[PDB]
From a paper:
The virus is decorated with a trimeric spike protein (S), which comprises an S1 subunit that binds host cells and an S2 subunit that is responsible for membrane fusion. The S1 subunit comprises an N-terminal domain (NTD); the receptor binding domain (RBD) that binds the host angiotensin-converting enzyme 2 (ACE2) receptor; and two additional subdomains, SD1 and SD2. In this study, antibodies isolated from convalescent subjects who were infected by the Washington-1 (WA-1) strain, which has an identical S sequence to Hu-1, were investigated for reactivity against WA-1 and variants of concern (VOCs), and we defined the structural features of their binding to S. The two most potent antibodies, A23-58.1 and B1-182.1, shared highly similar gene family usage in their heavy and light chains, despite being from different donors.
Antibody A23-58.1 binds to an epitope on the RBD that faces the threefold axis of the spike and is accessible only in the RBD-up conformation. The A23-58.1 paratope constituted all six complementarity-determining regions (CDRs) with heavy chain and light chain contributing 74 and 26% of the binding surface area, respectively. The 14-residue-long CDR H3, which is 48% of the heavy-chain paratope, kinks at Pro95 and Phe100F (Kabat numbering scheme for antibody residues) to form a foot-like loop that is stabilized by an intraloop disulfide bond between Cys97 and Cys100B at the arch. The CDRs formed an interfacial crater with a depth of ~10 Å and a diameter of ~20 Å at the opening. Paratope residues inside the crater were primarily aromatic or hydrophobic. The A23-58.1 epitope comprised residues between β5 and β6 at the tip of RBD. With the protruding Phe486 dipping into the crater formed by the CDRs, these residues formed a hook-like motif that is stabilized by an intraloop disulfide bond between Cys480 and Cys488. Aromatic residues—including Phe456, Tyr473, Phe486, and Tyr489—provided 48% (299 Å2) of the epitope. Lys417 and Glu484, which are located at the outer edge of the epitope, contributed only 3.7% of the binding surface. Overall, the cryo-EM analysis provides a structural basis for the potent neutralization of the E484K/Q mutant by A23-58.1.
Author numbering:
A (entry chain E): 1 to 27, 27A, 28 to 212
B (entry chain D): 1 to 52, 52A, 53 to 82, 82A, 82B, 82C, 83 to 100, 100A, ...
C (entry chain C): 332 to 527
């Protein structure tokens, strides 16, 4: 078929890197109609390299990359700290002009441990529609973070939605939160509510909650 | 300078059509083409097709053979896109593209891009948000925003400042099609029994300007 | 009263031509009457650059060239000494210092059939403007970019010719107005078309 899968999932290296990106295609495309796009989150994409081996109107760091009929690559020597975004392949030699999956880049911050604490529902919720409970995870570098609802004698995932923030600048860590929905009826069917988490810099698993009283 | 201008956001209902305008300027529009893509919320890019401004050339994707017609127009030197029978899976962000061609030679790359419109198909039940407080018991706290219609929303702290750990989270679509989010900022230290903590919130597309204090 | 020349069948022909491939017919060695054409006829827009249509029969020239083609309705003022546009700059470059008068009569009875009449063609893409009295009957693929394209369609590589979109009820603005433009010549040769 006509696909544009890319070998690297994610990249994480501090400023200064060879930054080799592979865009292995499947069908034979003449190396005349192909382009690379960069999309800084929060705005429109920009064109970087067109026609495989060329450059745009103006590009810093001397972006370089060239390939063949069924193989292309892009490399960024001495990756500047400003340049950190998503890169998309694209081919327009023949219809359809299928795009690519895209890759992501990030910096490394010697993996620090996160902090966990929960917010119990307030007095404003028992007379409103639905009473929700939220947990907060802050200041962790790695994406590897599993959140499990430690319901009293129950490990269920009937309904739960997560939220992820973009990369911070000053602190360069991530943050996640969890939300749950439950029957308004009494909320006292199970009196124990907790959220678990496992991480690299944690050793023994951490469990922290507070029953009402 | 040479740029491209696109229309503004729209809000529609399941079972209607839309129109998006790409008013090209600053370059010879006659010898050029426009490509139309469709980005989702943090997902991969797609394709919709393209037309030649020289008239008489359309090429759509296989899955979008129907439901879309790319009219061109030439009097106002713009380009139009029409997508019909909008469905709930079509909630996305629409872009625009063109090569920077100037008379003799056409540039081979889609250098210029549009600002990007936005469409949101839903049950069309506009409602103002409600603010819920969260207080702790070296600490963090914040006020929760819930139950507002799909639309851009802003949060503040009476200053648009005080970034001592302020975290605003992306909007989340619940089961009923209503948006929600939250924001929590950690307190400086164990001096939260005095001084001022307020979590004022702002809004503009409706007549809602709500505020709430937070106390332990 | 001798013999005439077949101005009748030149005008009363069924199918004239397409605009990008216009025909010619050298007319000489007879008498011609440029009076029945203008004295009483339905030929609108009988513009007569060169010498005024009045007192035209008496003057005699060597040879007469007849050119015929079909163009759009509202796009008829562009065919004149000078002027620029999609026409008269890619298909029929009429030179300055022109001699001869132009006839352009409307017609919506032998053209624009019911439904879609897609048979006429006109050049749309060309790298440079036409030389005076130049016809380019070519079909080769236009190169609008910086990369060679070998008989294929795609980005920055298009097709030169395009088809007209005449419709039975599109409107008075866009109707096929059959246009016949004449010319003249006079050089070191005994003139023959002296029609009193
Ligand atoms: C292409 O083919 C067409 C079709 O044949 C030619 O047009 C014909 O031309 C002839 C003359 O050459 C026309 O014949 C004339 O018909 C008149 C009657 O028609 C008119 O009647 C109404 C009545 O109200 C008028 O309102 C209206 O304008 C009509 O036009 C006759 O009365 C004429 O006779 C008179 O003129 C002759 C010649 O001067 C005199 O000798 C007579 O005594 C008399 O006074 C004349 O016979 C014919 O009508 C035209 N056909 C049409 C218009 O459909 C084209 O000429 C030909 N192309 C070329 C280049 O020749
Ligand atoms: C879109 O394409 C056009 C034309 O291909 C680009 O315009 C060109 O822009 C360059 C960059 O500034 C101009 O170069 C400058 O020209 C002046 C003229 O004196 C010269 O003094 C400068 O030193 C510099 O070389 C160039 O002139 C201009 N083209 C024309 C015909 O004026 C345009 O930049 C392209 N847009 C984008 C976003 O790339």
């Amino acid at each position: 078929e006509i696909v544009l899968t890319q070998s690297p999932g994610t990249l994480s290296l501090s400023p200064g890197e060879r930054a080799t990106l592979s865009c292995r295609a499947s069908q034979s495309v003449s190396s005349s109609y192909l382009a690379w796009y960069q999309q800084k989150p929060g705005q429109a994409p920009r064109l970087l390299i067109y026609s495989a081996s060329s450059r745009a109107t103006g590009i810093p760091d001397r972006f370089s990359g060239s390939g063949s009929g069924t193989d292309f690559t892009l490399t960024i020597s001495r990756l500047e700290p400003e340049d950190f975004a998503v890169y998309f392949c694209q081919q327009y030699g023949t219809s359809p002009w299928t795009f690519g999956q895209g890759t992501k880049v990030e910096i490394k911050r010697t993996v620090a441990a996160p902090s966990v604490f929960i917010f119990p529902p307030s007095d404003e919720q028992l007379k409103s529609g639905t009473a929700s409970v939220v947990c907060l995870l802050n200041n962790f570098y790695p994406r590897e973070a599993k959140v499990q609802w430690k319901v009293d004698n129950a490990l269920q995932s009937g309904n739960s939605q997560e939220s992820v923030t973009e990369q911070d600048s000053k602190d360069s860590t991530y943050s996640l939160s969890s939300t749950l929905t439950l029957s308004k009826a009494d909320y006292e069917k199970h009196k124990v509510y907790a959220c678990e988490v496992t991480h690299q810099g944690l050793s023994s698993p951490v469990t922290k909650s507070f029953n009402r009283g | 300078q040479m740029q491209l201008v696109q229309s503004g956001p729209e809000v529609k209902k399941p079972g209607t059509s839309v129109k998006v305008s790409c008013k090209a300027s600053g370059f010879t529009f006659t010898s050029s083409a426009v490509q139309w893509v469709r980005q989702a919320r943090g997902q991969r890019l797609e394709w919709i097709g393209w037309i030649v401004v020289g008239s008489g050339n359309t090429n759509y994707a296989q899955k979008f053979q129907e439901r879309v017609t790319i009219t061109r127009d030439m009097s106002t030197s713009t380009a139009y896109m029409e997508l019909s029978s909008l469905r709930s899976e079509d909630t996305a962000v629409y872009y625009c593209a063109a090569p920077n061609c100037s008379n003799v030679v056409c540039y081979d790359g889609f250098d210029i891009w549009g600002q990007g419109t936005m469409v949101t198909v839903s049950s069309a039940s506009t409602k103002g948000p409600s603010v819920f407080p969260l207080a702790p018991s070296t600490a963090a706290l914040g006020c929760l925003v819930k139950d507002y219609f799909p639309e851009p929303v802003t949060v503040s702290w009476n200053s648009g400042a005080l970034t001592s750990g302020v975290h605003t989270f992306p909007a989340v679509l619940q089961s009923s099609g209503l948006y929600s989010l939250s924001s929590v900022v950690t307190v400086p230290s164990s001096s939260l029994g005095t001084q001022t903590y307020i979590c004022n919130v702002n809004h503009k597309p409706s007549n809602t300007k709500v505020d709430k204090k937070v106390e332990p | 009263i001798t013999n005439l020349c077949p101005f009748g069948e030149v005008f009363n022909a069924t199918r004239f031509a397409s605009v990008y491939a216009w025909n010619r017919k050298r007319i000489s060695n007879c008498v011609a009457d440029y009076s029945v054409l203008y004295n009483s006829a339905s030929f609108s827009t009988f513009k007569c650059y060169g010498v005024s249509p009045t007192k035209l029969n008496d003057l005699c020239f060597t040879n007469v060239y007849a050119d015929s083609f079909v163009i759009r309705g509202d796009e008829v003022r562009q065919i004149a000494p000078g002027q620029t546009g999609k026409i008269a700059d890619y298909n029929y470059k009429l030179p300055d210092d022109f001699t001869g008068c132009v006839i352009a009569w409307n017609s919506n009875n032998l053209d624009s059939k019911v439904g879609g009449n897609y048979n006429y063609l006109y050049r749309l893409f060309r790298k440079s403007n036409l030389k005076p009295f130049e016809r380019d009957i070519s079909t080769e693929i236009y190169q609008a970019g910086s990369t060679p394209c070998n008989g294929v369609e795609g980005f920055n590589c298009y097709f030169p010719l395009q088809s007209y979109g005449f419709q039975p009820t599109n409107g008075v603005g866009y109707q096929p107005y059959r246009v016949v433009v004449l010319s003249f010549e006079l050089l070191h040769a005994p003139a023959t078309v002296c029609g009193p």
